[PDB]
Design a protein around this nucleic acid. Structure first.
Ligand SMILES: Nc1nc(O)c([C@H]2C[C@H](O)[C@@H](COP(=O)(O)OP(=O)(O)OP(=O)(O)O)O2)cc1N(O)O
Ligand SMILES: [Mg+2]
Ligand SMILES: [Mg+2]
Length: 522
DNA sequence: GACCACGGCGCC
DNA sequence: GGCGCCGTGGTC
């Protein structure tokens, strides 16, 4: 136990008042390096002395430092080491629980824990050349990028959504008071259980499905879809569900999350939260903003650009199909993208009996579910009742992947990111085949996730040069903010960085759009 | 108050 | 296939 400050290169531990770094109060700050722990008398002032956030959850402390106008980049983070060893290492509780430590709530102990866990995990990673490359060239630099992204935030049209809330509210009351009419009485329409009784016991409607854990009669949209004119109350419920979902999740909560000092909405990009290597967004999740329905697009317009700036949206086209062509090597699927063909449009045109010309974007979005559904083990049964109906060596790669997965316990992406799928030899078929679907999907979704992470690493410092910002990542999409006078060049540059991030056997192409709001930018 | 399981559902 | 957040119903 030594006096503050710590020497250069120590591991940091910190305690927040809450999980969100942009809203957190730094309750404590400590450091550790070689037999001693440096606890800070005043955590906020002690931030100015660190050159780097090195330790567990490094990005979170860096985001809080950017909130205070401090350039404190995140460095080594044992969480990132463990996540690359096994993507089920998602929390500091589990990592310490598994590699020799205990995740307490004292800054000093967290600094010493970060020191012990780094030495241990870094030891496990010796000889893992491809995972060390993913750590040095992707994940660790990415944590720095995501640090500035989270601290930047996005502009939100608050007064607009407040006005939209009143309009959506009264349209809800209409659908409700109606549902109560056909029901003959009032009840909590939000109550999943009360609805079941009204539908299947009082109205005697046929129960088409059962819930997973409690065996109750389901009221999901898919079930009600088959009842939407066996009775009229069903159609109103679906429209009621859609409205309350968007109002309670987006319209009302988001306006209340504008940050005092920045005046913008801030999310968190979790780097060790998925089994495939994707990022996740939380508090709030900005990777699930509505876009499907008209009302959803109304909400999407609330995401606007700063005055004098324009949003730039970039999105890889048919990304996982292009990745699939490279992973399998299918000459056909490879040649498909060499002719500039679009599978989502070709599938969407059989679905709706419409030529490729008049294929709207709502029926091609439906083709993605079909194409990617069919691709990853979709049963012939479920395909029937949603689109309303009664590539040779892809399979070769699937089996090669599953066989190798069974032999070594893990599948891997193009760059070597691993996911462990132990149930590939389970004796219960359903458990085995579910694991199989998880298994051969990971290399396709993870490679696409790798390319995107790697693109962000290469693009971000270029954006700093041009005075542009990186606002959001949506799996295979980037939302940037650039000054109006530079938006066009920024769009052309980012388009170029993303398409040539890591050449594949098929060209990567990116659709790009510019607009004052998120909807006009796509 | 907190946390939880569940059904349900928004997006990729 | 991969996520996170919703209200409800529930416990502590
Ligand atoms: N149901 C889905 N299932 C998936 O697995 C994806 C994965 C695979 C896909 O390539 C990737 C990015 O999604 P998207 O950008 O929306 O789809 P794509 O990149 O292939 O086609 P794009 O219109 O941009 O040319 O997420 C998406 C959907 N959407 O329903 O969406
Ligand atoms: Mg795409
Ligand atoms: Mg996309």
């Amino acid at each position: 136990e030594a006096p503050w400050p710590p020497p250069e290169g120590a591991f940091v531990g910190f305690v927040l008042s809450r999980k969100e770094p942009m809203w957190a109060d730094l309750l404590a700050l400590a450091a550790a390096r070689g037999g001693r722990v440096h606890r800070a008398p005043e955590p906020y002032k002690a931030l100015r002395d660190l050159k780097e956030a090195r330790g567990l959850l490094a990005k979170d402390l860096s985001v809080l430092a950017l909130r205070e106008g401090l350039g404190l980049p995140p460095g080594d983070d044992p969480m990132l080491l463990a996540y690359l060893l096994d993507p089920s290492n998602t929390t500091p509780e589990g990592v310490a629980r598994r590699y020799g430590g205990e995740w307490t709530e004292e800054a000093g102990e967290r600094a010493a824990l970060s020191e012990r866990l780094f030495a241990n995990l870094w030891g496990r990673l010796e000889g893992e050349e491809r995972l060390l490359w993913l750590y040095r060239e992707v994940e660790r630099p990415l944590s720095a990028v995501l640090a500035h992204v989270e601290a930047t935030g996005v502009r939100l049209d608050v007064a607009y959504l407040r006005a939209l809330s009143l309009e959506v509210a009264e349209e809800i009351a209409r659908l409700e008071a109606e549902v109560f009419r056909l029901a003959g009485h009032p009840f909590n329409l939000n109550s999943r259980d009360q609805l079941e009784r009204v539908l299947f016991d009082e109205l005697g409607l046929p129960a088409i499905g059962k819930t997973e854990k409690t065996g109750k009669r389901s009221t999901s949209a898919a079930v009600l879809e088959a009842l939407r004119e066996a009775h009229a109350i069903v159609e109103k419920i679906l429209q009621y569900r859609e409205l309350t979902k968007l109002k309670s999740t987006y319209i009302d909560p988001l306006p209340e999350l504008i940050h005092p000092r920045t005046g913008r909405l801030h999310t968190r990009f979790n780097q060790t939260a998925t089994a495939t290597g994707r990022l996740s967004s939380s508090d709030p999740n900005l990777q699930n903003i509505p876009v499907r329905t008209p009302l959803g697009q109304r909400i999407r317009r609330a995401f606007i650009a700063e005055e004098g700036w324009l949003l730039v949206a970039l999105d890889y086209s048919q990304i996982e199909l292009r990745v699939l062509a490279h992973l399998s090597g299918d000459e056909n699927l490879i040649r498909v993208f060499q002719e500039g063909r679009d599978i989502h449009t070709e599938t969407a045109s059989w679905m709706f009996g419409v030529p490729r010309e008049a294929v709207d974007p709502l029926m091609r979005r439906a083709a993605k579910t079909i194409n990617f559904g069919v691709l990853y083990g979709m049963s012939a049964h479920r395909l029937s009742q949603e689109l309303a109906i009664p590539f040779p060596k892809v399979r070769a790669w699937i089996e090669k992947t599953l066989e190798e997965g069974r032999r070594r316990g893990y599948v891997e992406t193009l760059f070597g990111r691993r996911r462990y799928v132990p149930d590939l030899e389970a004796r219960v078929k359903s458990v085995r085949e579910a694991a199989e679907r998880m298994a051969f999907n990971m290399p396709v979704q993870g490679t696409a996730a790798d390319l995107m992470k790697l693109a962000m690493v290469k693009l971000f410092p270029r954006l700093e040069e041009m005075g542009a910002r990186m606002l959001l990542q949506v799996h295979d999409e980037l939302v940037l903010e650039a000054p109006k006078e530079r938006a066009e060049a920024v769009a052309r540059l980012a388009k170029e960085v993303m398409e040539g991030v890591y050449p594949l056997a098929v060209p990567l192409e990116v659709e790009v759009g510019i607009g004052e709001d998120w909807l006009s930018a796509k």
